[PDB]
């Protein structure tokens, strides 16, 4: 309808123990993805052992299923404490 590509910020809270696996599966789920990665801010949040990786992925509101896909593929892996995605939209002007 209207070209409004939104940024979905996938915030994966994962143990540092398996962060590399988590991030590898993140990239794996980027294997032909509508969701186009911009950046992934990986900081320590809950605890130094739990790294929260908040990645900006651009996608349209027409692609919610892809977010599920990402979340599922990463949730298949161990180390993930919590995984949320924030729909950040464009500023309605």
UniProtKB/TrEMBL annotation:
Compartments in which it is found: Cell inner membrane; Cell membrane
Highest rank taxon of the organism: Bacteria
Domain MgtC-like C-terminal: residue ranges: 8-85
Segment forming the signal sequence: none
Job of this protein: Virulence factor required for growth in low Mg(2+) medium and for intramacrophage survival. May be involved in regulating membrane potential by activating Na(+)/K(+)-ATPase.
Homology family: Belongs to the MgtC/SapB family.
Name of the protein in its database record: Protein MgtC
Organism this protein belongs to: Pseudomonas aeruginosa (strain ATCC 15692 / DSM 22644 / CIP 104116 / JCM 14847 / LMG 12228 / 1C / PRS 101 / PAO1)
Upper classification of the organism: Bacteria, Pseudomonadati, Pseudomonadota, Gammaproteobacteria, Pseudomonadales
Part of the intact protein present: 142 to 234 of 234
């Amino acid at each position: 309808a209207s070209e409004a590509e939104q940024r979905y910020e996938v915030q994966i809270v994962c143990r540092a123990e398996d962060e590399i696996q988590v991030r590898s599966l993140m990239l794996h789920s980027l294997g032909s993805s509508d969701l186009r990665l911009q950046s992934l801010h990986s900081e320590d949040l809950d605890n130094p052992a739990k790294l929260e990786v908040r990645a900006e992925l651009l996608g349209t509101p027409e692609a919610p299923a892809q977010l599920e896909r990402l979340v599922s593929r990463v949730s298949l892996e161990k180390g993930v404490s919590s995984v949320r995605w924030q729909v950040f939209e464009l500023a309605a002007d």
